[PDB]
């Protein structure tokens, strides 16, 4: 249990993706909060077909190789580490 053990606090958010602009895919699980939550932390979310300027990207990068190919584990590990961790 990650989210339920992390975002279980309303949104906790925390200074995780601090300035971490990861492209949160709509196909990603927990997207609901994944979006608001993340960006809510203090970062930003770019639409797949919209990253060129983006910074991070959830699963995959193509749309934006200049972003970060982070996953759902990164958000937790990050928000949990109160500091952006190794994106993968």
From Swiss-Prot:
Subunit structure: Isoform 3 interacts (via BRCT domain) with the nuclear DNA-repair protein XRCC1. Interacts with POLG. Interacts with POLB.
S-S bonds: none
Function noted in UniProt: Isoform 3 functions as a heterodimer with DNA-repair protein XRCC1 in the nucleus and can correct defective DNA strand-break repair and sister chromatid exchange following treatment with ionizing radiation and alkylating agents. Isoform 1 is targeted to mitochondria, where it functions as a DNA ligase in mitochondrial base-excision DNA repair.
Residue span(s) of domain BRCT: 12-88
Disease connection: Mitochondrial DNA depletion syndrome 20, MNGIE type: An autosomal recessive mitochondrial disorder characterized by severe gut dysmotility, muscle weakness and atrophy, neurological abnormalities including epilepsy, migraine, stroke-like episodes, learning difficulties or cognitive decline, and neurogenic bladder. Brain imaging usually shows diffuse leukoencephalopathy and may show cerebellar atrophy. Disease onset can range from infancy to the teenage years.
Assigned protein family: Belongs to the ATP-dependent DNA ligase family.
Residues shown, of full length: 922 to 1009 of 1009
Record's comment describing the protein's domains: The PARP-type zinc finger is required for DNA ligase activity.
Top-level taxonomic group: Eukaryota
Signal peptide positions (record): none
UniProt tissue specificity: Testis, thymus, prostate and heart.
Organism of provenance: Homo sapiens (Human)
Name of the protein: DNA ligase 3
């Amino acid at each position: 249990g990650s989210a339920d053990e992390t975002l279980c606090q309303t949104k906790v958010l925390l200074d995780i993706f601090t300035g971490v602009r990861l492209y949160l895919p709509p196909s990603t699980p927990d997207f609901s909060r994944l979006r608001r939550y993340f960006v809510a932390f203090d970062g930003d979310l770019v639409q797949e077909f919209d990253m060129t300027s983006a910074t991070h990207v959830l699963g995959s990068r193509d749309k934006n190789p200049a972003a970060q190919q982070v996953s759902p584990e990164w958000i937790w590990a990050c928000i949990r580490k109160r500091r952006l961790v190794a994106p993968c």
